[PDB]
Amino acid sequence: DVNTLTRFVMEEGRKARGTGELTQLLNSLCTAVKAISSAVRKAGIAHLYGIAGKKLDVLSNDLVMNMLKSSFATCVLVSEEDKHAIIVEPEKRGKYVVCFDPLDGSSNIDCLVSVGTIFGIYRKKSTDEPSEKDALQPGRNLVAAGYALYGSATMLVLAMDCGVNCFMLDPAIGEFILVDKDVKIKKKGKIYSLNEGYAKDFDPAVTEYIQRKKFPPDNSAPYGARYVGSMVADVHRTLVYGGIFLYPANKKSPNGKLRLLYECNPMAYVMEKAGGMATTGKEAVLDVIPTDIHQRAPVILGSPDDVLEFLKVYEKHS
Amino acid sequence: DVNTLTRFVMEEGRKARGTGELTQLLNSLCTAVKAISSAVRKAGIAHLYGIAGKLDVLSNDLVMNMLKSSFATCVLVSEEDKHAIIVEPEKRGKYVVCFDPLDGSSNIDCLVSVGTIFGIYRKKSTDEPSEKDALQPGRNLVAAGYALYGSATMLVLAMDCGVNCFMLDPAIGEFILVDKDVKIKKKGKIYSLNEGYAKDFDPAVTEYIQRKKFPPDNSAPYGARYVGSMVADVHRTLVYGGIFLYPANKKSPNGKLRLLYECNPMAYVMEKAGGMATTGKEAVLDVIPTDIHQRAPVILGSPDDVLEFLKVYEKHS
Amino acid sequence: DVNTLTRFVMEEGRKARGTGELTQLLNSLCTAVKAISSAVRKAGIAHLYGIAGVKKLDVLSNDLVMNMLKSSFATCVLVSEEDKHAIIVEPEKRGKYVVCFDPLDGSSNIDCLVSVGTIFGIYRKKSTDEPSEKDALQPGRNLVAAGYALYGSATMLVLAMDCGVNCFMLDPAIGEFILVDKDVKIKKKGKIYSLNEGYAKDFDPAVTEYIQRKKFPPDNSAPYGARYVGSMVADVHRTLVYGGIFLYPANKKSPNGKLRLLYECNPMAYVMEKAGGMATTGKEAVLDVIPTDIHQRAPVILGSPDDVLEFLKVYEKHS
Amino acid sequence: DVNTLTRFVMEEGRKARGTGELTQLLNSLCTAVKAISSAVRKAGIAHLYGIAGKLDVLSNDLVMNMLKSSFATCVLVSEEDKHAIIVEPEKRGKYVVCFDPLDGSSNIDCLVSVGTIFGIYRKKSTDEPSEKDALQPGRNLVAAGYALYGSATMLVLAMDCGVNCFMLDPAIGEFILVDKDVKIKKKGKIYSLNEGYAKDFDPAVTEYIQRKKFPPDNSAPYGARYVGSMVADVHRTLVYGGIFLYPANKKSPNGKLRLLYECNPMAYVMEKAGGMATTGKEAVLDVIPTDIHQRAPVILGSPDDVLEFLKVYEKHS
Ligand SMILES: O=C(NCCCCCCCNC(=O)NS(=O)(=O)c1cccc(Cl)c1)NS(=O)(=O)c1cccc(Cl)c1
Ligand SMILES: O=C(NCCCCCCCNC(=O)NS(=O)(=O)c1cccc(Cl)c1)NS(=O)(=O)c1cccc(Cl)c1
DSSP: OOOBHHHHHHHHHHHTTOOSHHHHHHHHHHHHHHHHHHHHTTTTHHHHTTTTOOOHHHHHHHHHHHHHHHTTOEEEEEETTOSSOEEOOGGGEEEEEEEEEEEETGGGGGGTOOEEEEEEEEEOOOOSSOOGGGGOOOGGGOSEEEEEEESSSEEEEEEETTEEEEEEEETTTTEEEEEEOSOOOOSSOSEEEOOGGGGGGOOHHHHHHHHHHHSOTTOOOOOEEOBOSOHHHHHHHHHHHOOEEEEOOOSSOBTBSEEIIIIIHHHHHHHHHTTOEEEOSSSBGGGOOOSSTTOEEOEEEEOHHHHHHHHHHHHHTO | OOOBHHHHHHHHHHHTTOOSHHHHHHHHHHHHHHHHHHHHTTTTHHHHTTTTOOHHHHHHHHHHHHHHTTTOEEEEEETTOSSOEEOOGGGEEEEEEEEEEEETGGGGGGTOOEEEEEEEEEOOOOSOOOGGGGOOOGGGEEEEEEEEESSSEEEEEEETTEEEEEEEETTTTEEEEEEOSOOOOSSOSEEESOGGGGGGOOHHHHHHHHHHHSOSSSSOOOEEOBOSOHHHHHHHHHHHOOEEEEOOBTTBTTOSSBIIIIIHHHHHHHHHTTOEEEOSSSBGGGOOOSSTTOBOOEEEEOHHHHHHHHHHHHHTO | OOOBHHHHHHHHHHHTTOOSHHHHHHHHHHHHHHHHHHHHTTTTHHHHTTTTOOOOHHHHHHHHHHHHHHTTTOEEEEEETTOSSOEEOOGGGEEEEEEEEEEEETGGGGGGTOOEEEEEEEEEOOOSSOOOGGGGOOOGGGOSEEEEEEESSSEEEEEEETTEEEEEEEETTTTEEEEEEOSOOOOSSOSEEESOGGGGGGOOHHHHHHHHHHHSOTTSOOOOEEOBOSOHHHHHHHHHHHOOEEEEOOOSSOTTOSSBIIIIIHHHHHHHHHTTOEEEOSSSBGGGOOOSSTTOBOOEEEESHHHHHHHHHHHHHTO | OOOBHHHHHHHHHHHTTOOSHHHHHHHHHHHHHHHHHHHHTTTTHHHHTTTTOOHHHHHHHHHHHHHHTTTOEEEEEETTOSSOEEOOGGGBOSEEEEEEEEETGGGGGGTOOEEEEEEEEEOOSSSOOOGGGGOOOGGGOSEEEEEEESSSEEEEEEETTEEEEEEEETTTTEEEEEEOSOOOOSSOSEEEOOGGGGGGOOHHHHHHHHHHHSOTTOOOOOEEOBOSOHHHHHHHHHHHOOEEEEOOOSSOBTBSSBIIIIIHHHHHHHHHTTOEEEOSSSBGGGOOOSSTTOBOOEEEEOHHHHHHHHHHHTTOO
């Protein structure tokens, strides 16, 4: 039978005997994603070009902020767009903390590269007044995470304790349709994904690993390379086709480049739920304990046999 | 003033004192692109999944049916069809169109940007229409372009007047002119190829890429981007400058992209925007085709970058 | 704060401390309505006309509602204009609710692009018996929720429950129903009357007299304007919004009127009443008719309370 | 083969050896209409209600702006505007357009069908354009028609070649030709007028209606329909046959509907579809207006319904 995001969420919610506050959050977010999608695909751009006589990142942020606030399910919202945590007004406060990138990859949307919305959802743990500290939970504490991808089609990928599920937005009806259920990543893939433009900056572990992928020691076939440069796009591919995605530390980004709270954690959560792995090189992404909301981490994620092969190499270089 | 594709093509025709046949072709094409765009973004997918109780083929059928019915074509060459399609006598116009109705669709299961690529020729002889009519060098192109189905859907159309970019507004289904007479940066900061296959690289390609990552001087190393969808990679090259490479090697001495409906259209866009497109040995546009599906090596982008490639290429020749 | 139908229903449910089953029902029904709207506005019509080289809309509409409602896990008995007998939801899918609906009301004339619509009325199964056709035979008083989707110049969902009447505009850019008119009430007295006057020769002498009062007021007031779209959902919606009176009365040729009680008259009666309006057969409240056949007809006179009362006065004067 | 408004029009223009200017006009109108439809169906309404924290006026702006930049017009008359608009010299073309950008919008509050009405004239004179160029009998129309935003959006376009109906497919933003060379029923079974004005009716209209409810030849009484939006009523009249009436009353002694951009275009469509359109005294299209907003009575529809009305009229003088 046809399943929709709204039906699905509600039925997982009813099974879990919940009060429906996460559903309202998830419903509000779905609504925001469909609105983001519509702007991203440029509906109404004719009016901007004078048919009758905000920047996308800013609008997408406003969509997500306003929908989550008005859901009555959140208290603290961290956004790539906002310098400090946003604290929901008392009258609209609920139990959840949400970290999100409202339009990841947007820096290069001028070229119509896939962009995405990434989100991670935590239960507020502290009984203190809500503040920025509430979003400084390790990703292991994630209740649910995921992303919407505005690629050739729009897709929302939702990860919960019950698994990873993939919904396609049908823009003729503004409905997310369940198309891939309880999704698992391939044990081993055949694609590696990273900016090799930073080759001069790589630590020897990354350098050796990539040399293994191009000139395999067992004389198997070399891995293919893909690198969109938009994280949602690369991670989705990695989930769908298997393989490995990398954004290691470099001289410009000595703590890595991607943001822990709202890029690494949500993706690592989706990966782990689908049977994959995500590591900083020293430790599972999900184990890192944040100290700063916009702090960065290095990340290697994807198929378990690929990440493990990377960590055998990492261990080799100590 | 607001400018749409329908308006744009029609005013160019009137300048050129044309009959409207190219305009009828381009309108039909653009109609096909809106339809492919609607299907790629998955409108109606709820019905497939039972709310009430292929894509590359559809895209092919759309382009093929709109073009035939435009009354402006006589010979249609598609990546999807083994032979050239000869238009029925009653529907024959003067143009020969080569196209890839959905480029990059091999990986569409991961929602990668995809595209439609097309190149339009004037039929050069009065012989009965046949595949030979599509075997013209890229130099002979009348119009070429691509539709990119990315974050948004954009039509890039190159003609003698230059390269013009039109954004699809799905709310009304109009291609709105958003970037006029566009030109590529003289030199970029990005390189684009599949490095996974480095061991099969031609020596020249190895050296050039090495130099992009490890510059001899004080310059920054280039960034690397590779979508694996030609339309997406070329359009980024257009917007940001740089270089896109699908070069020849020993196991593929004519490369892998198809000349008629991938390489040539993109090479024509690049040249009209002030870029270059080479096989290593000659401009892609000067290759005289002998087979409609023949392969061609392609290296394109900012002129400084493509010339630096040719410097390294020739070093190894 | 912005309010979408999904959000609205959810917050009513929590104020009623409900299990969520009627929300699932309504959620499902809104999905079907967006799909009906999309089909009605002729999305994809280019494919029928050979752009790349089939069901009638009322059939597609029935298929959509039936299917979304069955899969909501919230229904047990479904009556639709399309089907001779009640549909009994399969055991694995059963829920507590009974739905009577008209999937694409007015679609006979759809060829002229007339406004069409979907009407629905929801009940709780009363009996402990196995679900059957009997469970649909409740008087409209027993309605939990009712309403319609109007596919007109825009698509609107009017929902009426105990809390009153709320109107939700469908934003087709994003597939959301946005609450635009809240706790809606009809005018005490309107200035338009609505019926097929072309069949005047068969009119009830009471209806004849009333329409004459409207066209030739005995009292120096301005005569009413007439509007009759010919599509119940459009006329009833205009009745709610501008006030006035809509008629489909019983005559000699048709002692029980023409519209169907369970999935046409009842829901509009229920919406009218929750908006402070009235709906009568001429003899009783439409909502008070205890039905004995799921496809039985009932006369209907509805709209602003003063207008309906004035009709009743005339009607009772002819006994 | 599939046909689009874009393609249909361009192909009529080529058969006529036209210079393309009317095509540019109609393409522009086409675009304006899709943008009106998107607005009417309430796309974007969520942004009005705070999702991220006038309809008649927008419609007018869309038609006015699109027509001006079409380079094809010189005098624009609108229901929305007191005086005729004179297109500036640089955007000036040879056509006059009179239009109602959102007919029936005074009750759009209840989501009644609304529509756009247009009629197009050629300016012959070498005079500087002026309001009075719009003062022409409908007989002089080059093209006319309407777009109806009902359950679906349909453009009806009437030209010398006949009447052609185009459904807007909003999936792709394209007008698809669905009904070719349309001809109205010889006689219908629906009459359409506001019977709330019966106290005011001329005895000729009273009698005619009486004939509808009580047929003298013992045929079946007609049904009555009255949306109250002219485009919806007239369109149902084109599709199902019958008769439409807005005659003179007390509040509107010269009729209520506007000759130049309600009556004339509907009359012209009706006549091109083999129907009729009469003030009672003469053909609508034969009226010579002296005021761009002048009112006219209109009785239109199936020819045998119109003659039966006129038969009754000619009896009461
Ligand atoms: O979703 C969850 N439980 C189900 C939702 C229960 C709360 C929302 C519905 C409120 N109640 C009604 O609507 N009642 S009614 O329908 O009878 C009604 C009554 C009167 C009027 C109307 Cl219109 C309706 N829990 S969770 O969100 O914590 C969750 C936990 C785990 C995983 C996920 Cl994804 C989610
Ligand atoms: O576009 C081109 N020429 C201008 C086309 C416009 C004029 C001729 C169009 C057909 N005639 C009409 O429509 N006449 S009408 O409007 O009076 C009319 C008359 C009766 C009915 C109706 Cl509805 C209309 N040439 S091109 O295609 O070779 C080209 C060349 C170079 C670059 C490009 Cl992109 C294109």
